[PDB]
Write a protein that binds this ligand. Structure first.
Ligand SMILES: Nc1ncnc2c1ncn2[C@@H]1O[C@H](CSCC[C@H](N)C(=O)O)[C@@H](O)[C@H]1O
Ligand code: NI
Ligand code: NI
Ligand SMILES: [Zn+2]
Ligand SMILES: [Zn+2]
Ligand SMILES: [Zn+2]
Lengths: 10, 430
């Protein structure tokens, strides 16, 4: 995952 | 004088620092706006959005040197130059060899901004970048190796135009970027880029947030999605709210180093339906369900990696397969089924199979409205996509109904005068 603040999981 | 009207920074017990409302805010009310301290457009959207202001416009004029950066006009081209200059010459120099991660690209810009504007900017009225939380003390070996790899990439790709601090300052900076950074998504939640919004970064997380962050070009905007009373803490969501409590918390613990204790995480009310199992004669034994949950969550990561090495047909096969295996235990409304249906929809959209995507979307939409909050961009974007698909396939009635369902949420989240809304209303009148 390792994402920044997000609404949709990429 | 007050830095941000009707709000104040405070110490939120158990959550470090936070943002508090001083006055009442109602649904759709704008709490505040925050210009980007630093931001970078994703490579894939180049030529579609202006590098400076993010306006999505046709016939954008490109940069003469790198021919990679596109702009509205010369003013936007010139205004962006202090930042673009960090990549312009290098993309020419390093050809296809130039693959800095987005985060590294963002951090170079932050470093640049610190150098140009050391004083507090208008984007730092309550919280400054230098103040960002880092959790350096909680970082493990792997995360640290990853940060060093990012630092190495930054040196490799940015050394001639940017002066660097000692290694520890870079470790801290990357660590702050990791827990205070944002992604900018368009009206369909498509990834546009990454940015730093310091005042927005002050708000703590909840899985049932009372505000939504949206973007107007590169301007961050914060609007209420529930009633906010004076003295109440203001909460946004850092993550995708579709998943069950454990998943959300595994991600929050993993990326932000805290376990959420909001009502949804405490009561877990949405979990039963998110993990809906189908009603059979047997029924499924608990062990098998726990096993299907592990399988589903395993396939999520397998799928996420495979986007990089597999063809669309194959990814589709993964989705059909996974759904088939999981459907032995799981009901269609279950979020793990939905993740795969959603991904499958995305593949369909990629292979231009509009009918297939529409057939998945119609199946995805209802359970989404249940799992997500009342005003959720994840739901709105879905209604929007469904609507545009209907409109494109010449089914105007359903198109209007879906666009109206999207608009009703978007008026709250983006504000009535947002250009996206005018665009969607302008799409209906055709
Ligand atoms: N809901 C929550 N529960 C506990 N800690 C939270 C939280 N939401 C945010 N945090 C904390 O805040 C960080 C995100 S940046 C938010 C601002 C931060 N609290 C500060 O004082 O600067 C997280 O890494 C986490 O440690
Ligand atoms: Ni404090
Ligand atoms: Ni809720
Ligand atoms: Zn522009
Ligand atoms: Zn250039
Ligand atoms: Zn929570």
């Amino acid at each position: 995952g390792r994402m920044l603040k997000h609404k949709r999981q990429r | 004088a007050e830095g941000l009207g009707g709000l104040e920074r405070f110490c939120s017990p158990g959550k470090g620092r936070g943002l508090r409302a001083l006055q009442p805010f109602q649904v759709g009310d704008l709490l505040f706006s925050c210009p980007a301290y630093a931001y970078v457009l994703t490579v894939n959207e180049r030529g579609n959005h202006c590098e400076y202001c993010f306006t999505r416009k046709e016939g954008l004029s490109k940069c003469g040197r790198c021919k990679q950066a596109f702009y509205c006009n010369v003013e936007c081209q010139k205004e962006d130059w202090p930042m673009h200059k960090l990549e312009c010459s290098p993309m020419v120099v390093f050809g296809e060899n130039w693959n800095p991660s987005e985060t590294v690209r963002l951090t170079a810009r932050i470093l640049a901004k610190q150098k140009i504007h050391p004083e507090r900017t208008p984007s730092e009225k309550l919280l400054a970048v230098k103040e960002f939380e880092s959790h350096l003390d909680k970082l493990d070996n792997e995360k640290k190796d990853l940060i060093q790899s990012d630092i190495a990439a930054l040196h490799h790709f940015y050394s001639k135009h940017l002066e660097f601090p000692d290694n520890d300052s870079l470790v801290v900076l990357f660590a702050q970027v990791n827990c205070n950074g944002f992604t900018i998504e368009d009206e369909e939640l498509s990834h546009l880029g990454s940015a730093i919004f310091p005042d927005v970064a002050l708000m703590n997380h909840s899985c049932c947030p009372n505000v939504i962050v949206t973007y107007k070009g590169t301007l961050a905007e914060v609007r209420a999605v529930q009633e906010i009373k004076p003295g109440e803490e203001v909460f946004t969501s850092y993550i995708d709210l579709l998943y069950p409590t454990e998943d959300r918390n595994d991600r929050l613990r993993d990326s932000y180093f805290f376990t959420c204790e909001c009502q949804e995480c405490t009561t877990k009310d949405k979990d039963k339906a998110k993990v809906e199992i189908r009603k059979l004669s047997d029924p499924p034994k608990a062990e098998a369900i726990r096993d299907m949950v592990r399988y589903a969550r395993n396939v999520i990561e397998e799928f996420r990696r495979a986007k990089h090495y597999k063809s669309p047909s194959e990814l589709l096969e993964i989705c059909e397969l996974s759904q088939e295996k999981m459907s032995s235990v799981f009901e269609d409304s279950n979020v793990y089924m939905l993740h795969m249906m959603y991904q499958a929809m995305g593949v369909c959209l990629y292979m231009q199979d509009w009918e297939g995507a529409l057939q998945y979307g119609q199946k995805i939409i209802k359970p989404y409205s249940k799992h997500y909050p009342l005003y959720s961009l994840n739901v709105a974007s879905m209604w929007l996509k469904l609507g545009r698909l209907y409109m494109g396939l010449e089914h105007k009635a359903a198109g209007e109904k879906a666009l109206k369902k999207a608009i009703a949420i978007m008026e709250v989240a983006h504000g009535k005068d947002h250009p996206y809304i005018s665009e969607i209303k302008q799409e209906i009148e055709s």
